[PDB]
Amino acid sequence: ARKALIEKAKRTPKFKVRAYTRCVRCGRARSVYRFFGLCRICLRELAHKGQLPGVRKASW
Amino acid sequence: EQYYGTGRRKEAVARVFLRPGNGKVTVNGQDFNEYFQGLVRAVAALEPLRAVDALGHFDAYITVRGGGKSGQIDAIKLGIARALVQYNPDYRAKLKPLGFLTRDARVVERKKYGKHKARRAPQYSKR
Amino acid sequence: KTAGXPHKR
Amino acid sequence: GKGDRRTRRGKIWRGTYGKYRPR
Amino acid sequence: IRIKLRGFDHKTLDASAQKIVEAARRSGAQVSGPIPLPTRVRRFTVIRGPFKHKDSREHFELRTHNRLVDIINPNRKTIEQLMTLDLPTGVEIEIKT
Amino acid sequence: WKLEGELRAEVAANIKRLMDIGCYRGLRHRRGLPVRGQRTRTNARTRKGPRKTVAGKKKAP
Amino acid sequence: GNKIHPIGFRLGITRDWESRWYAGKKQYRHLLLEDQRIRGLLEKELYSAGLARVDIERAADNVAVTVHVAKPGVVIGRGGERIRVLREELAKLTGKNVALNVQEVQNPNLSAPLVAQRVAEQIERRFAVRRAIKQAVQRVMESGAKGAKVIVSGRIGGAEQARTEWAAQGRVPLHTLRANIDYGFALARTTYGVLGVKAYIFLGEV
Amino acid sequence: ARRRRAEVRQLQPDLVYGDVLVTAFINKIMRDGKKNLAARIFYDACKIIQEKTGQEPLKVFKQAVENVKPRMEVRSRRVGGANYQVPMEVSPRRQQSLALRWLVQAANQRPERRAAVRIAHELMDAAEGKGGAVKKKEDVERMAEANRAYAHYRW
Amino acid sequence: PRSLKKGVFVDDHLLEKVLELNAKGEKRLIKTWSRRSTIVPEMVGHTIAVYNGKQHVPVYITENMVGHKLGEFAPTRTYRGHG
RNA sequence: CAGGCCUUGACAUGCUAGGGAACCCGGGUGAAAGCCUGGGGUGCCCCGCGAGGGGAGCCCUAGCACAGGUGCUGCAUGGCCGUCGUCAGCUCGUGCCGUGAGGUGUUGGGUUAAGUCCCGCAACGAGCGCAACCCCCGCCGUUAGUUGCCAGCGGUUCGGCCGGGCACUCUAACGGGACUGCCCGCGAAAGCGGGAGGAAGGAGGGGACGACGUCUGGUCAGCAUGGCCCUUACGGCCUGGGCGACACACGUGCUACAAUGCCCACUACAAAGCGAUGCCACCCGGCAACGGGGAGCUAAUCGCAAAAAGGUGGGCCCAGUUCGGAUUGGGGUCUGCAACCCGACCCCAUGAAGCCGGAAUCGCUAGUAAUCGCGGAUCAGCCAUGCCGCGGUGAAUACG
Ligand SMILES: [Mg+2]
Ligand SMILES: [Mg+2]
Ligand SMILES: [Mg+2]
Ligand SMILES: [Mg+2]
Ligand SMILES: [Mg+2]
Ligand SMILES: [Mg+2]
Ligand SMILES: [Mg+2]
Ligand SMILES: [Mg+2]
Ligand SMILES: [Mg+2]
Ligand SMILES: [Mg+2]
Ligand SMILES: [Mg+2]
Ligand SMILES: [Mg+2]
Ligand SMILES: [Mg+2]
Ligand SMILES: [Mg+2]
Ligand SMILES: [Mg+2]
Ligand SMILES: [Mg+2]
Ligand SMILES: [Mg+2]
Ligand SMILES: [Mg+2]
Ligand SMILES: [Mg+2]
Ligand SMILES: [Mg+2]
Ligand SMILES: [Mg+2]
Ligand SMILES: [Mg+2]
Ligand SMILES: [Mg+2]
Ligand SMILES: [Mg+2]
Ligand SMILES: [Mg+2]
Ligand SMILES: [Mg+2]
Ligand SMILES: [Mg+2]
Ligand SMILES: [Mg+2]
Ligand SMILES: [Mg+2]
Ligand SMILES: [Mg+2]
Ligand SMILES: [Mg+2]
Ligand SMILES: [Mg+2]
Ligand SMILES: [Mg+2]
Ligand SMILES: [Mg+2]
Ligand SMILES: [Mg+2]
Ligand SMILES: [Mg+2]
Ligand SMILES: [Mg+2]
Ligand SMILES: [Mg+2]
Ligand SMILES: [Mg+2]
Ligand SMILES: [Mg+2]
Ligand SMILES: [Mg+2]
Ligand SMILES: [Mg+2]
Ligand SMILES: [Mg+2]
Ligand SMILES: [Mg+2]
Ligand SMILES: [Mg+2]
Ligand SMILES: [Mg+2]
Ligand SMILES: [Mg+2]
Ligand SMILES: [Mg+2]
Ligand SMILES: [Mg+2]
Ligand SMILES: [Mg+2]
Ligand SMILES: [Mg+2]
Ligand SMILES: [Mg+2]
Ligand SMILES: [Mg+2]
Ligand SMILES: [Mg+2]
Ligand SMILES: [Mg+2]
Ligand SMILES: [Mg+2]
Ligand SMILES: [Zn+2]
């Protein structure tokens, strides 16, 4: 239950509650940031890669 | 007509204006003992002049924002001690030996990932 | 060893 | 204490308001 | 003539602030200097590993710096010259009155 | 207001009819189990009572 | 299982983003998805041209897409034929003004993603992994670099026991921030599974 | 504390009597960072201790501290796997610390409802040689006298 | 519970079956998967087969159970104790 | 998991074939999915006054190829992570010694947080590590003066409110600054002690950063991937259920057992963040949750907002209580299609255990521990007492 579920998420749901976030890149239904539309894993991979504008490792 | 110092300590910043007078102080638009009422530590912000005997010779107009009422106090204690050496550079000695000329960098340490606070750790238990 | 489908466990 | 919703400290603890901590 | 510009890289942001402030310093009159607004920070804290390892993280921030420049007396020689200006891609500008 | 013994009558009467009809709450007043949807895997000791320890599963020597 | 990524470690210092633009919380994801969706198509096609980088810049309803490459030929095409045929298909997904460019790679053997891809490709052809590594390092140092290290990890030669093997020359100080270290990864699929090639090229300190 | 021995923190003298020993004693009263409340308790008792028994408050405080400082205590040493009770002379730093610590603890064991009264009476009883904190000092001094046989293991 | 500014909630497709019965001279067994339906005075006297995830459980409706929900009388877990 | 359904399939490319569909609204049945169905009616280019016939986005159905699998193998793998360990280490080139594994260098004296340096030496160099370059904090400067600031004049509905100004506080970019650089002493040196100056002194405090490798450590369920297995089913859609069960046992936590406390009223002082189907001032209804109005702000402007501990005054008087707030009855509010299973919140009533915890065991060396509140991510709501952050108050102790 993966590809059918990554496709059903894009679909408009019978009710606005059944809509849930989903990583655009890998398809994770969990730990999905609204801002990037990514998940915590892909977010880390693209940040280290430099393909996320302005984002960088924070240090304080 | 004025003598100014900037006192900082722990997110609290102080602007001290020392004008000659009866020894009357106000802080943020109200009286000293009105703004520090009930805080025994309050009498420590006016300690530097005790070292130069300037007790009742200066009135003080002082504003403070940020931090907390005890961090604000230590800022005042540095601020007036910073204005006095501006008024009288000779106040260098007898003030620096009393450490009134320095600001402590002692601020809150950041919380870190995998702890409860900066150093308090989650409880350990093998098995 | 790891339940998943038929193998269940 | 903080566990009693029917007091001010409890309302603060759960971050709610009511008769026992109004605005 | 109220001009605010934004970006993630401040070096590109402060650069384009110095350009425009000197565009009105050529033709025009009074510039209100490039005043820096407080930086708004959106942070992201992630479990550093793909599985299980909760007590190991990694922090990421996204900084959106803000600069403000005000042109006092416009003089449409400036309002013309501004149309031709090299504005890098890392900066987005907004103008009101 | 109705008070003391009179109040306890209606509290009893409501619990009893919850058990009579056989709703999910009345089933939990039967068995003395938590009624407001709490966990029973642990805790529940106020509603369930003092612990009744049992022999467990063992390892190999 | 411990070392941090060498680029993301130096971003804003010795390395700059491969997507340079501003956006707001309203359409940041929509644009970033576009970058990824665009960058997906490019690496798929321009692979045979040896794609070493994709730069993206944006203003509004327009985009840069500066493609660095070792062989501008497979990009431009006949008098600018492929460069058009792709730019056509490009904005066919962007719906914007997509102005593709093509920058030449000075020394390809001084680019990390290329060295990794040459080794990843060489081992798909069943070449001696241990040798391909030493040669690649040898080329990068002959190309003047101040240091190089190359890592292949997996079932080398198809062995059942997985293994890691590497070679290095000069110096590669990953802990040093002012040290420009180009990093690049290439993944080689084989009859027996996936291998992983890490290339580290140390250009110099700034 | 392997490398170097630690440094002893110097305390800001109190804003009334200007005495470090007073500041240290308030810190032993303080719980959860409430030094304001702490100093407030200590001073209220100074009132009580000047009302009852009209001596000077600060004078009663210091003498009570003196009557609670232990000059000898037992520690542990080795010689094989054995665990001896060795009588040791108490350092001035430690005499003060144990005296202050036992006072608050003895005070809080008292039955008076409010905190300042417990501290007032304990400081009074201690300055006259009674109280739990003095009974604790004499108790410690006894155990070092009994195990005086093992005094030759001292360092 | 549900805001009374909203309605006493019934899935309609069940209330439909109930009302046609009252008109036609009930009874009839009623199989529903709608546990979330609120019992309602038009249901008094019938028996409703409420699904509990595995089976449709008959529930004779009485006056004293009118205000409740349907799933309350089709328990969802079989337990019968330990040991 | 149960049951009702779908069979080139929810999805990818590719091949035909019939309809020849595009798109948007309906109907019957049904829990829904599904099955059955009815209307609004195709641009390319064309033979076009002709009936129109084809070609094609894209659709529908039939049929293939193939898709699909969070099925298995982390003992086939990539990638990433944990870990030893921020421990001072692991090595290489040539030379020398040894038949050889290998040794030497890297040992030794001294030194340091450190294979950090000094000195010595069949060793002489070099690499990965250490340190440094990077970030936050502490002092100072410069450049800036609105939405931030108000020192001093001028008005002032008495609110930095208007004039005025950028001094200051600030905000945010670039610089300065510390080097054991100076003095004394020890020393062969590196360094060590002490002192001066200084906001800061011996790496200033915190962060980012994790050597060759180890655990055949973790992850085939984020993703990728070899191989094995399923193909009207281990794939796919749906409604409902379960993931929340409960004789029990363990971990991590919240709230407490009270007077340095609890309650009520009044009154102060933060920081970091967040906010256009968002934050929502202010007003009214309501004990209230909230509802209804209804400004302002794409936000150093308007809002979240009250910070809490604290300060003042007042009450309780050592009680299982004006401690504790579990459990349960009843009544409501909000989100949501829907709160039975199985939501949060408000109000009335209920007011359990618990009198400081057996054997045992954990954290922390300073703005730390303890305590006090604040925000954010996820997010309709929320079982968050969790996590990542933020500041307020602020200790004890280190002989060894
Ligand atoms: Mg399935
Ligand atoms: Mg998949
Ligand atoms: Mg949701
Ligand atoms: Mg999600
Ligand atoms: Mg600051
Ligand atoms: Mg704190
Ligand atoms: Mg907290
Ligand atoms: Mg109470
Ligand atoms: Mg809030
Ligand atoms: Mg944890
Ligand atoms: Mg780590
Ligand atoms: Mg419930
Ligand atoms: Mg509940
Ligand atoms: Mg519950
Ligand atoms: Mg339950
Ligand atoms: Mg084969
Ligand atoms: Mg493994
Ligand atoms: Mg692995
Ligand atoms: Mg196997
Ligand atoms: Mg170290
Ligand atoms: Mg080791
Ligand atoms: Mg070793
Ligand atoms: Mg050799
Ligand atoms: Mg030889
Ligand atoms: Mg021989
Ligand atoms: Mg050797
Ligand atoms: Mg040597
Ligand atoms: Mg060694
Ligand atoms: Mg060796
Ligand atoms: Mg040796
Ligand atoms: Mg070295
Ligand atoms: Mg200035
Ligand atoms: Mg380092
Ligand atoms: Mg294993
Ligand atoms: Mg395992
Ligand atoms: Mg596999
Ligand atoms: Mg997989
Ligand atoms: Mg469920
Ligand atoms: Mg669970
Ligand atoms: Mg908890
Ligand atoms: Mg516990
Ligand atoms: Mg939020
Ligand atoms: Mg209060
Ligand atoms: Mg009781
Ligand atoms: Mg009892
Ligand atoms: Mg009570
Ligand atoms: Mg109820
Ligand atoms: Mg529920
Ligand atoms: Mg009691
Ligand atoms: Mg205890
Ligand atoms: Mg306690
Ligand atoms: Mg420590
Ligand atoms: Mg408490
Ligand atoms: Mg929510
Ligand atoms: Mg939420
Ligand atoms: Mg919170
Ligand atoms: Zn993802």
Side-chain angles (χ1 to χ4, degrees), chain A, chain B residues 2-8 10-33 35-42 44-89 91-93 95-100 102-124 126-127, chain C residues 1 3-9, chain D, chain E residues 2 4-10 12-18 20 22-24 27-29 31-70 74 78 81-82 86 88-95 97, chain F, chain G residues 1-25 27-40 42-60 62-73 76-77 79-81 84 86 88 90-91 95-97 99-105 107-120 122-145 147-206, chain H residues 1-3 5-46 48-52 54-58 60-82 84-134 136-147 149-155, chain I residues 1-11 13-23 25-27 29-83:
Chain A
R2 179 53 144 191
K3 208 173 170 187
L5 267 53
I6 192 184
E7 195 67 29
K8 184 185 294 165
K10 304 167 168 170
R11 199 178 60 174
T12 58
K14 290 191 292 181
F15 312 91
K16 62 175 193 169
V17 268
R18 302 199 175 174
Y20 56 91
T21 330
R22 180 76 79 170
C23 182
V24 293
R25 190 180 194 195
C26 74
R28 276 179 71 97
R30 247 188 201 96
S31 283
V32 268
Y33 292 81
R34 298 171 158 185
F35 187 99
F36 293 99
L38 296 174
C39 77
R40 62 173 187 79
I41 308 168
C42 300
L43 162 48
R44 178 165 185 262
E45 290 184 355
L46 291 182
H48 288 275
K49 210 180 180 197
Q51 295 185 1
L52 297 176
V55 192
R56 61 183 300 173
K57 289 180 58 76
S59 165
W60 67 105
Chain B
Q2 276 170 329
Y3 295 98
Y4 173 76
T6 290
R8 293 195 198 90
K10 181 182 180 189
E11 292 296 338
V13 295
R15 288 170 47 193
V16 161
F17 288 105
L18 294 184
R19 313 187 191 195
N22 306 321
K24 306 301 178 282
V25 183
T26 181
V27 174
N28 275 332
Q30 52 183 9
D31 188 64
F32 184 96
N33 295 264
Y35 186 79
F36 292 147
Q37 165 190 12
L39 308 188
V40 189
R41 197 182 172 169
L46 309 161
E47 189 66 13
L49 48 76
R50 190 172 175 174
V52 303
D53 299 321
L55 182 66
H57 300 280
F58 296 93
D59 294 351
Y61 175 78
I62 303 177
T63 183
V64 291
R65 61 187 62 90
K69 282 184 176 298
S70 187
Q72 289 172 346
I73 285 176
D74 280 339
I76 293 170
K77 194 191 68 175
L78 178 55
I80 88 182
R82 191 168 288 187
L84 289 185
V85 285
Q86 181 187 18
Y87 162 78
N88 183 352
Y91 282 165
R92 178 68 61 186
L95 271 190
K96 173 184 174 297
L98 271 65
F100 295 162
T102 180
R103 171 194 171 165
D104 57 17
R106 313 189 295 119
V107 308
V108 163
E109 192 168 348
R110 65 165 294 232
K111 184 181 180 305
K112 305 173 185 66
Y113 59 95
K115 307 289 188 55
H116 286 299
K117 301 166 68 176
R119 305 171 174 193
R120 165 65 189 194
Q123 196 182 17
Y124 174 70
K126 56 171 82 162
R127 98 198 118 248
Chain C
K1 237 120 65 263
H7 290 283
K8 44 166 237 244
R9 359 180 106 136
Chain D
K2 306 178 201 165
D4 180 16
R5 303 172 176 81
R6 205 178 285 194
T7 62
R8 182 180 71 96
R9 186 57 52 175
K11 295 287 188 195
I12 300 178
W13 190 86
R14 313 191 163 267
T16 58
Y17 302 97
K19 185 173 68 173
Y20 303 97
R21 175 179 165 246
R23 300 164 278 194
Chain E
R2 154 78 37 104
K4 195 199 305 195
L5 18 74
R6 296 161 181 166
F8 296 142
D9 181 16
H10 68 81
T12 59
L13 186 58
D14 291 337
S16 297
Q18 295 288 119
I20 299 310
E22 291 152 12
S27 74
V31 292
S32 189
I35 61 166
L37 301 177
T39 309
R40 193 176 284 255
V41 165
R42 172 171 287 109
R43 280 176 191 175
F44 304 99
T45 296
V46 49
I47 287 176
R48 194 184 284 250
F51 181 74
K52 79 176 297 183
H53 297 301
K54 177 69 158 286
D55 286 336
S56 183
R57 307 293 188 88
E58 187 171 25
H59 292 300
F60 302 99
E61 67 187 2
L62 186 50
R63 297 187 170 275
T64 74
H65 313 265
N66 294 281
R67 299 296 178 269
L68 188 64
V69 288
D70 286 339
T78 318
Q81 166 178 26
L82 289 174
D86 183 73
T89 40
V91 172
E92 184 246 355
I93 68 184
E94 204 167 2
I95 306 95
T97 297
Chain F
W1 308 281
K2 65 174 56 173
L3 315 167
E4 208 54 40
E6 185 180 6
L7 206 165
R8 277 176 295 248
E10 181 197 336
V11 182
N14 287 304
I15 300 193
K16 174 169 184 50
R17 63 162 292 272
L18 281 169
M19 295 182 296
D20 299 335
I21 65 180
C23 72
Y24 184 83
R25 289 172 61 196
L27 298 175
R28 306 228 145 242
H29 282 100
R30 281 181 191 169
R31 289 181 172 158
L33 280 176
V35 173
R36 299 190 188 266
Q38 301 92 323
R39 283 182 59 172
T40 51
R41 184 174 200 193
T42 59
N43 296 344
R45 287 307 164 188
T46 303
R47 182 74 187 151
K48 195 197 291 197
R51 298 188 188 186
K52 303 187 305 307
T53 311
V54 179
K57 187 176 167 65
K58 296 180 287 301
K59 193 49 182 183
Chain G
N2 29 8
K3 281 173 278 298
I4 199 186
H5 185 114
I7 294 323
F9 181 52
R10 281 162 189 82
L11 284 183
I13 298 182
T14 331
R15 295 291 294 243
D16 199 72
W17 288 256
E18 296 170 351
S19 289
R20 306 182 184 86
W21 43 266
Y22 171 88
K25 66 176 166 55
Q27 69 286 326
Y28 192 105
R29 45 182 302 167
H30 298 96
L31 253 57
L32 161 68
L33 171 55
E34 188 168 19
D35 295 355
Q36 288 299 315
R37 189 169 300 180
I38 289 169
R39 202 187 261 92
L42 285 168
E43 300 163 352
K44 178 164 178 295
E45 300 300 327
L46 305 182
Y47 173 95
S48 60
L51 189 144
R53 184 153 191 170
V54 165
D55 293 296
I56 306 294
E57 299 151 0
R58 293 175 171 276
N62 50 354
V63 57
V65 191
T66 308
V67 167
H68 291 70
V69 98
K71 292 183 174 171
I76 51 180
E81 182 56 37
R84 286 178 75 265
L86 295 182
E88 186 178 359
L90 195 64
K96 298 178 169 67
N97 305 335
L100 169 66
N101 306 331
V102 168
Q103 291 284 109
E104 197 197 12
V105 169
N107 209 317
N109 295 343
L110 287 182
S111 159
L114 269 25
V115 178
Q117 286 159 347
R118 185 174 164 84
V119 177
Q122 269 189 5
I123 67 187
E124 291 177 326
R125 300 166 180 171
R126 300 176 179 269
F127 284 2
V129 178
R130 184 61 194 175
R131 175 185 291 179
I133 294 179
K134 289 178 194 279
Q135 297 174 346
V137 167
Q138 189 66 40
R139 286 189 298 265
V140 176
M141 303 305 291
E142 288 179 358
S143 293
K149 182 174 74 167
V150 184
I151 281 94
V152 185
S153 187
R155 305 179 51 179
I156 298 179
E160 183 170 14
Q161 188 67 269
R163 189 175 53 187
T164 290
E165 280 189 351
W166 61 275
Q169 204 176 337
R171 48 179 284 172
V172 177
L174 287 88
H175 293 263
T176 299
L177 286 154
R178 72 172 180 264
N180 183 14
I181 293 184
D182 188 25
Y183 169 85
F185 180 82
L187 176 145
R189 178 182 70 84
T190 51
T191 305
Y192 49 84
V194 157
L195 299 141
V197 204
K198 298 185 181 188
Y200 302 75
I201 300 193
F202 175 50
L203 305 163
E205 309 167 12
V206 296
Chain H
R2 294 198 186 268
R3 304 192 173 279
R5 58 172 161 189
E7 74 289 20
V8 184
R9 294 178 183 272
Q10 291 304 311
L11 287 67
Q12 193 56 36
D14 73 303
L15 275 51
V16 177
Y17 304 84
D19 188 17
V20 285
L21 176 58
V22 171
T23 294
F25 182 73
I26 292 184
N27 291 160
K28 297 312 293 176
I29 308 164
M30 181 183 36
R31 297 190 288 175
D32 312 357
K34 295 188 166 179
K35 165 180 281 290
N36 206 37
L37 174 59
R40 177 181 294 187
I41 299 170
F42 170 78
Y43 289 134
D44 288 342
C46 289
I48 304 169
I49 215 173
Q50 185 178 335
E51 302 159 346
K52 307 174 170 178
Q55 294 96 359
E56 177 65 32
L58 178 63
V60 184
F61 171 80
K62 286 172 182 297
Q63 188 60 37
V65 163
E66 191 57 41
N67 293 348
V68 182
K69 285 178 192 164
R71 306 179 295 284
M72 303 290 305
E73 70 166 348
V74 289
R75 306 174 67 79
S76 298
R77 201 183 168 165
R78 51 150 198 99
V79 186
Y84 295 101
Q85 303 283 287
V86 180
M88 283 304 295
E89 64 284 346
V90 194
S91 71
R93 167 97 181 99
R94 184 165 165 83
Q95 291 191 1
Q96 183 169 311
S97 308
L98 299 175
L100 299 172
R101 181 182 304 149
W102 298 339
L103 252 60
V104 190
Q105 293 174 344
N108 297 337
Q109 286 180 337
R110 282 189 86 88
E112 291 93 358
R113 290 213 205 277
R114 63 199 57 86
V117 178
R118 299 193 300 267
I119 305 192
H121 292 175
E122 185 61 30
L123 279 164
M124 278 168 72
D125 287 346
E128 293 175 16
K130 303 175 175 193
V134 179
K136 172 59 178 184
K137 179 200 76 90
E138 298 167 353
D139 209 334
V140 176
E141 283 179 343
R142 274 197 311 276
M143 298 197 64
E145 180 73 349
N147 293 102
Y150 297 140
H152 66 291
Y153 285 141
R154 72 187 181 280
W155 57 87
Chain I
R2 182 171 179 78
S3 273
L4 53 88
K5 80 166 57 167
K6 310 195 173 186
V8 163
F9 178 86
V10 174
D11 274 350
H13 62 67
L14 169 72
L15 189 54
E16 172 178 2
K17 297 190 181 67
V18 181
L19 293 185
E20 299 178 356
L21 279 181
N22 307 327
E26 59 272 34
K27 309 293 171 188
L29 179 75
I30 308 178
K31 305 173 60 182
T32 171
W33 294 253
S34 186
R35 307 174 53 78
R36 62 183 182 177
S37 296
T38 297
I39 303 174
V40 77
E42 288 85 352
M43 298 159 165
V44 180
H46 297 84
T47 63
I48 304 166
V50 181
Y51 198 66
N52 58 8
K54 175 188 193 175
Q55 273 184 335
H56 297 278
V57 170
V59 174
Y60 175 73
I61 315 286
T62 71
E63 292 172 17
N64 45 12
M65 66 174 79
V66 155
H68 295 76
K69 319 283 290 192
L70 260 314
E72 290 192 14
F73 299 86
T76 183
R77 299 178 174 100
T78 60
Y79 167 52
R80 62 181 77 94
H82 294 88

